[PDB]
Design a protein around this nucleic acid. Structure first.
Ligand code: MG
Ligand code: MG
Ligand code: MG
Ligand code: MG
Ligand code: MG
Ligand code: MG
Ligand code: MG
Ligand code: MG
Ligand code: MG
Ligand code: ZN
Lengths: 136, 97, 122, 45, 116, 85, 107, 95, 23
RNA sequence: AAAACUCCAGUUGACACAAAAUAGACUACGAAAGUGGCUUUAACAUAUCUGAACACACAAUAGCUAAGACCCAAACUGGGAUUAGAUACCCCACUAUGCUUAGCCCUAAACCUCAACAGUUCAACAAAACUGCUCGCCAGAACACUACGAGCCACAGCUUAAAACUCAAA
């Protein structure tokens, strides 16, 4: 019976959260990388609610790109979100990285409720020419 | 005197035709702890698994009716100059006698 | 030969849509076209956002027309449709049924190739 | 025999006179090309 | 299911160019690749994270860290016993997948031949 | 970008099963063949060695499929030796 | 250089071209269709002008006129696209084969 | 003599398999049919082994998909959420 | 196979390029 | 790890002469090099085979000439790390250039190193052995993708291509 796909602004959506429709839910955006991860929270109408990162938490060159720092940033952002009055959240993840999976669990431990996860990672259809292959 | 061509033309297999999805009666000659080998017709014996239902009623000389897919399980693989065999035939049963 | 123009207009009312359509078919006749038929696919919100000459559009009106014309008229009408402002997009294409489908006998089973490597001990 | 089909269709072909009615009839009418198919090959709309 | 290989290789009778250029000769062998490890063990990350959290909260106070510290110890213990259990599982035989040595035994019982 | 948001490559969580959601997302991405593409677009792949890698992958798939056919065709035979002598 | 209004090759034996509408006559005029029908009409014209037995494609003269029409097609294509080296090579080879078969016919 | 075999065709020959639409027609406007053959989450179209049709039809439908995408009848990233509630033909395993 | 001969050719070509650069 | 940027970074809205995922597990076209976004046009030789290194026409990338184009990448260069040293592999920035025009150059492992045509069923390795006709090429290693000569819009180039001395090998 459960629908894995998300609802549509066009009717009908038979599931709400906190008595609210899907669209107006706040959206979290996280950008993963081999070196570091950046997290941010925004309202449905693009109002920037919360923002944090491993660098702001105080992680150094090698350690920014880890899962522990990502989940700590998640904890911090969840604390700020609940302080501002935010419970539910629609997740958005962008790119690969170590802390990709870790930031979500950090948010959960913080105490937010993730509803859906969208991987809006960059995909070029042969648009640009990337960097040359480095020899490790 | 009888001609081998006539015996072939009147043989059971020339009238049998393809073995795919065709009922046939058979009996067993050897049996193991978990499986039984039915001799039904033609060249090879077909292996089968004892069903938990009616499993006790499986002894030598039992006439079981069953379908089948082919008479010899073979297959030609990538570097197989000639098809390899399994010396069996797949046959599934749905009744006895 | 046959030519189908698949066209998508911006969302507006029947009078101005009809004015646009009559002007467009007048341009067709000027280029020397012969219209076979007009088909309205209906009004729909186009799938992805686009950018018109001067603005953006989140809805559109899908029309199609089938006609006959020489070749030069094709690109002349293309540039006409590019110069036109209220038209979101328009594309000329050939007709599919004009190209008779090759008679099909079904899928043939492809036997596995052999004799690629010669026999030896290896 | 092939000439006969597109011969009578000339009257079906619009012109400067039939436009002012065919345009309205077409824009008032609706048409759909979409159609799906099942495992066997039966069409369903 | 397998894709055909009619004229993908460079054979004298094939007029067109080759599709494939396999470095090694394309033949089904009677030996199967033995399995291999997947990654290096890691665990208790969230446990030590909440432990350091309560550490920096209470200035290294054990009676207050009790919960986090006990959870971390229990998670590490469970990780060790799970390692032992899955090790004995691999030794006795993985269920659902067939083992390489017995597969090779079967293949040498029913071997391929490139030659006659 | 121009396309609508929160439709493609999404997963709806049920009972807060975030691990299952993310695992299913990775699974669908791999079955569609994406993450390999991302890690190939990370650093540039020359056309020559791209073609080489791709031909090798095709041959590997062929070999694996044939060996899997043999395995699935002969695993039925792996049973207790009925004829000792 | 046949006229544009000349109907297609196929629609000539039919006696309905007289009573049929002028719009249909225009539709069937080769100017609507591609240059293939124009060169077909040209080939028929040359066959009727020179050849004693028309609709005989196996003939050396028929092959020669076909290749000549193809040569004119390639020449027009090249004067419109000075850069098409494929069509350039095709034109050169066509004229070479034409000279070859002209020598053979002369023999 | 009469009982001997004879040169003869194979009557047991089963009719050659025909794909879902080996004979039918397709155009770039049947967005429903063209989105039936595509992954809903990624929007990328499945291959032959997943689809189960002949190469001619696969090529035709993929070209039609590209045409629809570029002109505006179809999107490229997300399958249309109005046409997924249709019969599922292409085999999969993730569900 | 071995490529010693083409390495010889490589070195000769390199030295010739250097020689023309000097002269 | 350092250097570098904070006129930095993230969401959101608008934007290209740039390169054209998935399909493609498909094996198609082109003489070959090459060609896999979409649309239109023109069009894809020879119904005996061979065949010019006395000619003609193409000919990847790179490079040169004069206008333009600036997302990205990047020779060279500069800086930061490593190193005994690093004129390199690692990191950052930028340029020729890769792109569009009108020309030039005519080289590749241009190899599938397996010539075209009509056919048949054993040195080793490789991609089994062969028949009939034809063109081109080869005759110890190295000097030699060399010098001299000749031709080329080429001027540190390209094509053809030896000779003297050395060795019993290659
Ligand atoms: Mg190799
Ligand atoms: Mg591909
Ligand atoms: Mg250049
Ligand atoms: Mg530049
Ligand atoms: Mg090549
Ligand atoms: Mg060669
Ligand atoms: Mg030759
Ligand atoms: Mg050279
Ligand atoms: Mg020289
Ligand atoms: Zn079919």
């Amino acid at each position: 019976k459960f629908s894995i796909y998300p609802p549509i602004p066009g009717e009908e959506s038979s599931l709400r959260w906190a008595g609210k429709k899907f669209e107006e839910i706040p959206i979290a955006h996280i950008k993963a990388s081999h070196n570091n991860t950046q997290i941010q929270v925004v309202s449905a109408s693009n109002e920037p609610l919360a923002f944090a990162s491993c660098g702001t938490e105080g992680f150094r060159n090698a350690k920014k790109g880890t899962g522990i720092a990502a989940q700590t940033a998640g904890i911090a952002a969840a604390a700020r979100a609940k302080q501002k009055g935010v419970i539910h959240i629609r997740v958005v993840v962008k790119g690969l990285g170590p802390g990709r999976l870790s930031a979500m669990h950090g948010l959960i431990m913080g105490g937010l409720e993730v509803i859906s996860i969208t991987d809006n990672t960059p995909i070029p259809h042969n648009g640009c020419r990337p960097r040359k292959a480095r020899k490790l | 005197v009888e001609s081998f061509a006539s015996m072939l033309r009147h043989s059971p297999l020339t009238q049998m035709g393809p073995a795919k999805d065709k009922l046939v009666i058979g009996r067993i000659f050897h049996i193991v702890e978990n499986d039984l080998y039915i001799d039904f017709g033609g060249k090879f014996h077909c292996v089968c698994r004892r069903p938990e239902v009616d499993g006790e009623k499986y002894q030598k000389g039992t006439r079981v009716r069953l379908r089948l897919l082919d008479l010899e399980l073979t297959s030609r693989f990538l570097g197989a100059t000639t098809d390899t065999t399994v010396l069996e035939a797949n046959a599934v049963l749905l009744g006895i006698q | 030969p046959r030519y189908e123009l698949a066209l998508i207009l911006k969302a507006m009312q029947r009078p101005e849509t009809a004015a646009t359509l009559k002007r467009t078919i007048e341009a067709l006749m000027d280029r020397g076209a012969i219209v076979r038929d007009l088909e309205n696919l209906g009004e729909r919100a186009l799938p992805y956002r686009i950018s018109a000459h001067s603005q953006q559009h989140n809805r559109g009106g899908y029309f199609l027309v089938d006609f006959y014309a020489p070749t030069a008229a094709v690109e002349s009408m293309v540039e006409h449709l590019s110069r036109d402002i209220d038209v979101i997009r328009g594309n000329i294409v050939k007709h599919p049924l004009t190209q008779e489908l090759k008679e099909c006998e079904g899928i043939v089973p492809v036997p596995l190739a052999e004799k690629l490597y010669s026999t030896k001990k290896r | 025999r092939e000439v006969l089909q597109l011969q009578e269709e000339v009257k079906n072909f619009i012109t400067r006179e039939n436009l002012e009615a065919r345009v309205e009839a077409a824009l008032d009418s609706r048409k759909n090309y979409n159609w799906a198919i099942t495992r066997e090959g039966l069409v369903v709309r | 299911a397998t894709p055909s290989l009619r004229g993908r290789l460079a054979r004298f009778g094939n007029p067109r160019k080759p599709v494939l250029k396999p470095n090694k000769p394309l033949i089904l062998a009677n030996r199967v690749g033995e399995r291999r490890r997947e990654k290096g063990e890691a665990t208790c990350i969230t446990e030590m994270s909440v432990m350091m959290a309560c550490w920096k909260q209470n200035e290294f106070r054990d009676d207050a860290c009790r919960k986090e510290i006990q959870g971390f110890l229990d998670c590490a213990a469970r990780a060790q016993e799970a390692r032992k259990m899955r090790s004995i599982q691999e030794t006795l035989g993985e269920s659902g997948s067939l083992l390489p040595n017995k597969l090779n035994k079967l293949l040498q019982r029913f071997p391929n031949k490139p030659y006659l | 970008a121009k396309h609508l948001k929160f439709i493609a490559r999404t997963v709806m969580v049920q009972e807060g099963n975030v691990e299952s959601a993310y695992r299913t997302l990775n699974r669908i991405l791999t079955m569609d063949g994406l993450i390999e593409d991302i890690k190939h677009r990370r650093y540039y792949e020359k056309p020559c060695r791209r073609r080489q890698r791709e031909s090798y992958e095709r041959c590997r798939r062929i070999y694996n499929m044939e060996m899997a056919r043999k395995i699935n065709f002969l695993m039925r035979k792996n049973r207790a030796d009925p004829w000792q002598g | 250089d046949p006229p544009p209004s000349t109907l297609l090759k196929d629609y000539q034996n039919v006696p309905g071209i007289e009573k049929v509408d002028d719009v249909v006559k225009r539709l069937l005029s080769l100017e609507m269709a591609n240059k293939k029908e124009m060169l077909k009409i040209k080939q028929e014209q040359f066959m009727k002008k020179i050849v004693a037995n028309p609709e005989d494609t196996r003939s050396l003269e028929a092959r020669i006129i076909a290749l000549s029409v193809k040569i004119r097609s390639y020449e027009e294509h090249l004067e419109k696209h000075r850069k098409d080296k494929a069509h350039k090579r095709y034109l050169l080879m066509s004229i070479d084969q034409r000279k070859k078969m002209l020598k053979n016919l002369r023999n | 003599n009469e009982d001997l075999p004879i040169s003869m065709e194979n009557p047991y020959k089963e009719p050659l398999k025909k794909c879902i639409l080996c004979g039918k027609h397709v155009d770039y406007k049947n967005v429903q049919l063209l989105s039936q053959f595509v992954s809903p989450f990624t929007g990328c179209i499945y291959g032959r082994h997943i689809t189960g049709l002949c190469g001619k039809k696969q090529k035709e439908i993929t070209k039609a998909i590209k045409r629809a995408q570029i002109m505006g009848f179809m999107p490229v990233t997300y399958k249309d959420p109005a046409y997924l509630k249709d019969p599922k033909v292409c085999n999969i395993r993730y569900r | 196979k071995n490529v010693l001969k083409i390495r010889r050719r490589k070195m000769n070509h390199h030295k010739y390029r250097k020689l023309v650069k000097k002269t």
